[PDB]
Symmetry: D2
Subunit: 487 residues, 4 copies
């Protein structure tokens, strides 16, 4: 890397670190377009702008630094917030979005193609509100910022007693060694950094399935330090972004990274949850023959109902042309599988982290060679066979890494939920309404998010008469469905 | 009694029935034997539970539509030891050959295709009336009419106990409810504590469908619900399969049998976009129609638009569309005023509930209108103003069951394995604590079991989590695999 | 003659017929009246050409399947002045109510659902035999059996003229051809120059389907074709609509009526991927089956793969698949050897041609096999080796027409407006030059007219080229719009 | 432009002009991938390599200078040809493909973002075989090289008699003024350039519908100077490339250029021929509600059968979000239409030239303003309304201009037909088999193209028995369909 890990500042004194500030004008042009595609965000600015509900608030966000996220940030700032941000993936930043935000609106520490050390430095920077303290609020995607704070508190409690430091030797996970080393270094400067932080944090709102999994784990073990709102599981997030967003951005990533024809191919989708449903839909609708793997018999049965074959990976590894992992689990596509794939099979992950595909096993395979075709398209050649596979985005989120992730309209659904969650936490900061638990937004607000997006599309809703509303036992104004309704 | 009185017949062994034609039993058996192969969950239930006879001594009254699929369910209950009496929950949904085979071989059945409402309610009363040994212990219901009769019967019996007063159909202007009050009145002459006994003995009801479950929550909210209920509809393996994929199959089947109309190239309106509407819209669009959805729920409307469907109000499209399908579970969707604007030979049907999604009452009384029956369950109503018609299917009642055969066996095996599980759970807790006078759903592990029992038939090969992987996603190797509030 | 002799009946006015049940005429009329609305091309043909009576004096024999759709075609021919006699070209395809309404109201008809082959050929002979005034002038054929009878009849008459020898069914081992030779033999006793007269007078034949057109080219190549032929199948508005979208409709309809099987979740094999196979595969995949295609043509195979369908040989999939559909127009696609490998209750059907895509002969003679009829046109053949069955639809004959109602009216209006146009063209050139003893297709401007006549019904609004735009793409404003070899 | 219109030369003396030669290594990496996706081309190299059928031949091609075309060029050269090339569109060149070819294989005059003067200069250069003469063979796409030769001959015949030059004032078409001026300049150096050329040209093979239209016009008016093979109308070209290729590359162009969500939108496809069918399929399968316009009642009826609404443009102009022209005709989307479109409606052309969309009217609208978002995405703002539209690739082919055009696999079908057509013309150069008319390849070769692509996809063909072949009256080895079969 040529990056020097020293913050820069705007003329006004606001910190940042981005690839290229000269891209700000281009960022602004695309943000202007995105705004039109994001009516829920823009409506939120109109509704809440006058009252400046986030005046005086300090918000840290660790969410992919895209054009979409720029619109979200500029909604928080339109509402009065001061904001610091980082990306939650080393390849997901759109550098022009980051530049525009750094120039005009918020402190940003993000660039496309970070190293893992840089990633974690940016995370620290986004949390670093200086001696006065902060953040008041956190917007998280995947849970890494939340993780750092919780791990930090734990380390601080040990250090305070015995003077023991985290030891990277205690983990075999190369990235978690980084984390432990950063926590150690922080103890050596301020051994109560995270204590002070957690005592000020009003809450976190979490974007994605994997992050929410991490939250429920912390709830269950009594370690969660502050309230959390699960944004993922709003209906208007999970059943839109995860599904329709990947239906858009999976083929976009494939096409940009490889230009491969999807029609006529065999594609394997590991998992058939919301993401796998959307990926399988895209591949099928592009003319691929899609094979699904699953552990959940209900999801497997759904896939069969949709005309998809359900097999185990071992039955199709030498046949398939394209492999997509969507599971949120580890150890889906191992080195042993990769070695059996046809020459130039495309292997990618749209789920989580770097461990759905066995990138560790690949990189450490004796005699393997990596040929970079272009950024985020790598061909790995095996010495036994002298054939190769194509790995996208080093096994990290392929849609954001190889293309631009989901489009604005669907991200407006997700991010209107984020605004609503942040407003709820902040408005209730002094009320005691929320405990140190995980909450979801109520149905009437989930419905409001949908309703805010109808006019853009020309969708005309019918109004119940009072008689009709009574007949199905709902209010005229909703909510319209029972608590456990699945849509 | 009356020349035209409805009277039960009896098999050689004395078991009561009333069906269209007992000579259709052999045909019924032939199609049941095919259905069994298509219903692995039910057959697996027979293999697993048959030897232990878990329903020994239990009496079950059911009202699931008297189809070939229901026949396999009935014969699973009897394989498990139950004694069964049955009726259909719709006047047009019985498959007469299914009813005959069951009547001959397995259970008392009071059902035929083309009942009147008077006949319908008589059949329901008969399915309930077990004679001096009492019963039922268990109820399987679809839409809640059996449950309603019991609750209304208790109320009438209370009044009778206090004052000796009988119900009086003159007290209501609801044509159907007049029939119900009449049934109860005449029933007090034979056994004025029928329903009180029943509600001391009934263990619970398991309810098939969305509208029936609405009715159960209304009774729970008002404190009138008399016994526990399991909401089978809201198992994932019911709602997300039957309501969705079932209708995807049976909607076009009903249209094609009733009318033979080409769906391709048409404009079709689907009112509602819940599970049934989603499946109907899918079928229509799959077949080459251009589908327009109406909705009241902004989430469902946004879903439709994501799927490439136009969302409008009915008024916007009523003069243009060729096919109209109501899926709402609500009233007053397609009114006479709408019908008067429709083109010649627009097809109008209901796959949701009852007879009131389409304004059949308003149609009946429209001045100068003429109903011309094309064939059973296809009727062309001619508007005098224009000398044009609309084609109403199944008199505005469930078109899939009324004009075709309803859902296919495989998906009904999913629904009905949930029914068997529900029945077993209610009975196995007959003397327990676990179920109060409230509505319950089956637990996720059993929902997953239902799906798992259907995979082999389709050749679907499931992956097994390693222990390490199961821990990584915080689930047990054996499931359940998803959080409580997962939506699939 | 024989106790069981087939004898014609006569209407009050003396017109001959033989149908299942004349009492079904009113029902037939009701459904014809609905079909008319769905068949704008035919109704427009009546409006345009009715007053000029272009078929005055013409006698037309037809064999298009005797459906409600065909009824609208017949009544278009009669509206234009023709006298008509008709039979069905399949033993299972007649809709008896359609046949009765036509027999009552419009034309001599010899057709019922469930004919024997002996009855089939008798009906064909009757549709041809006009009595002393002679006829037909024109033939409408589907599959070529009527055309074949005439050609075989001429040959027999030649032999008879030369030597007085009659055909002898002993001369052939082909069971069906024995029947044909018998018909001709007995026909020489009544009119030994029937077919010679016919082939001096017949103006031409218009042929509906791919296999019939194959037969016509074989006769043209060998120099035996006796009169002009118009290949209606290969109008774009026939092949690319009926064969494709028609089957997309009528394949699933046949499956659902015959078996009620859930298509979703199954594996379905479609043998062939021409127009019919494309439409069948589309329906199956639309319905949620996983479709595997077999093909001999690499172009068609590549098309299937582009559409996300697996292409394999039958042998690769015979033990796994749930549904098999032959679409080829070829012989010996699904042999007994294949059938013996199929799973219990695999469904096996033919939508292509004749009775020889599936090896029904081999099935019949398989040692120990047992045919169990479930209901008409659904038969379960039980293999003794495994005590498992296969479900054969319509005895291996066209399953869509045999198990359901064939294509719907709208798409048949496209096909049948081409038939009317073909008939008009042959007749209007009755004394001309234009048509020799060869196969012709209709010109593109008429193909376009057929489509144009169907747009209004669907609300499709066509753009008009400016003069400048028409010149830019080198077409006339009024069309034709595409080059001769355009494939659509 | 910063381009200097002077040829460069390789070390070996071969001429070229490309954007950036340093991109050759990257070009080569992607060509290596494409080869695997192009089995028909690679099989052609294996079959015909030994015999070197194009040894001694000089081939000019004017076909989009993509990675796909690079594989085609390198098949011609593997077979012995010496090659000169240009792109047939100002935005379709992939600069890394051009560089690799310029370095390794053939003279290339092509770059992404040419001006029209540069485009025509490159065309001249690709035809310029120096004093020895050439080309022997032409590969054309859209007919511009063919046009230049025919117009040139005509001008030469006039000039030879009266000394009259072409006069650009005789056309109001800005681009045809360029052409006439280049012909005039050429008369002033060699007044028999095109005569000599045409007397040596063995034939042309033409890629696309519009080009074939131009050929049939020249046939019909007796002006066609040499044999032509219509490659477009091979079944394995028209019903694959035009259909499935656009089903891939239309959404790719939209997504790269705009990142707009297609799902939930209304999209208008003008035309429903092969290209419009493929575009409508893509849009529908992505979740857009597609409205088709058509002049051909058969095509309109097909669209209705597929569940698409057929209307005139005027009925939907203010509703639709995305407009795609596929017609090969002019004056589809006029200025008057554009002025009625909603803010940020996307307008693009995947058919031909620059006149499906009224780019002239737009550019000359008083007070209009153009804002370039990024190359090939332009927002035009109207003064009456102060709202804008988004024009892709300046109204030129959007798939090639905004993305990378069709993928390799389908282009292997098209380009195997091109190889076969060139081999036919060249092998028959001295035989008199071909007249000055337009031919199509025979069915057995069309079938061979398909068959060459089956193994890649795992498609297993059934073999007819002799009895079966007889039954349907075809040979065991084909061809399998009648002459007029439409597939
Ligand atoms: N890249 C993006 O833009 C994007 C969008 C949304 C969510 N996500 C991420 O995608 C992942 C999936 O999210 P989701 O909402 O679909 O979750 P989900 O829980 O709905 O679906 C995951 C599915 O994977 C299955 N599965 C688990 N282990 C498996 C294994 N070993 N083999 C096969 N199947 C297995 C599960 O049964 C489940 O159905 C999460 O990591 C989430 O954070 C990414
Ligand atoms: N960009 C690409 O990669 C690509 C791929 C193949 C072909 N092409 C080009 O695409 C264009 C279309 O090719 P095609 O093969 O589909 O041609 P086609 O002739 O099959 O289809 C064009 C259609 O446009 C219709 N049409 C003509 N004028 C119209 C008007 N005013 N309004 C509406 N419809 C109108 C015609 O009726 C016709 O059906 C041609 O210019 C061709 O060269 C481009
Ligand atoms: Na994006
Ligand atoms: Na059914
Ligand atoms: Na029909
Ligand atoms: Na490309």
């Amino acid at each position: 890397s040529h990056m020097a890990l020293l913050v820069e500042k705007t003329t006004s004194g606001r910190e940042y670190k981005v690839k290229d500030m000269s891209q700000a004008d281009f960022g602004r042009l695309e943000i202007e377009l995105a705004e039109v595609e994001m009516p829920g965000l823009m409506a939120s600015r109109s509704e809440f702008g006058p009252s400046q509900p986030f005046k005086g608030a300090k918000i840290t966000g660790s969410l992919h630094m895209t054009i979409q996220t720029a619109v979200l940030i500029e909604t928080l700032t339109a509402l009065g917030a001061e904001v610091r941000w980082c990306s939650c993936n080393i390849f997901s930043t759109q550098d022009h979005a980051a530049a525009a935000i750094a120039r005009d609106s918020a402190a940003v520490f993000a660039w496309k193609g970070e190293t893992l050390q840089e990633y974690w430095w940016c995370t620290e920077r986004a949390l670093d509100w200086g001696p006065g303290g902060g953040p008041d609020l956190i917007v998280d995607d995947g849970g890494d910022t939340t993780l750092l704070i919780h791990e930090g508190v734990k380390a601080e409690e040990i250090y305070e007693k015995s003077g023991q430091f985290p030891d990277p030797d205690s983990t075999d996970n190369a990235e978690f060694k980084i984390v432990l080393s950063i926590i150690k270094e922080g103890l050596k400067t301020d051994p109560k950094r995270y204590h002070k932080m957690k005592d000020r944090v009003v809450g976190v709102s979490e974007e994605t399935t994997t992050g929410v999994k991490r939250l429920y784990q912390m709830q269950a073990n009594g370690t969660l330090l502050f309230p959390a709102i699960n944004v993922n599981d709003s209906v208007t997030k999970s059943k839109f972004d995860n599904l329709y967003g990947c239906r858009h951005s999976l083929p976009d990533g494939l096409m940009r990274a490889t230009d491969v024809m999807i029609a006529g191919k065999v594609a394997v989708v590991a998992g058939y949850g919301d993401v796998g449903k959307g990926c399988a839909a895209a591949l099928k609708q592009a003319g691929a023959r899609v094979i699904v793997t699953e552990i959940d018999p209900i999801c497997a049965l759904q896939a069969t109902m949709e005309g998809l074959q359900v097999l185990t990976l071992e039955d199709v590894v030498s046949e398939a042309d394209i492999f997509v992992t969507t599971t949120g689990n580890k150890d889906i596509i191992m080195l042993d599988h990769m070695k059996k794939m046809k020459n130039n099979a495309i292997v990618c992950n749209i789920g989580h982290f770097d461990n759905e595909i066995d990138m560790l096993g690949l990189e450490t395979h004796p005699g393997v060679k990596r040929i970079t075709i272009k950024p985020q398209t790598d061909r790995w050649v095996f010495p036994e066979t002298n054939t190769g596979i194509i790995i996208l985005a080093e096994g990290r989120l392929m849609n954001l890494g190889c293309a631009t992730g989901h489009p604005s309209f669907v991200m407006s659904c997700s991010f209107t939920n984020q605004v609503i969650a942040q407003l709820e936490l902040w408005n209730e900061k002094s009320s005691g309404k929320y405990e140190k638990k995980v909450y979801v937004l109520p149905k009437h607000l989930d419905e409001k998010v949908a309703a805010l997006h109808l006019e853009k599309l020309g969708a005309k809703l019918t109004k119940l008469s009072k008689d009709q509303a009574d007949y199905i036992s709902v209010p005229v104004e909703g909510p319209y469905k029972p608590f456990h309704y699945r849509y």
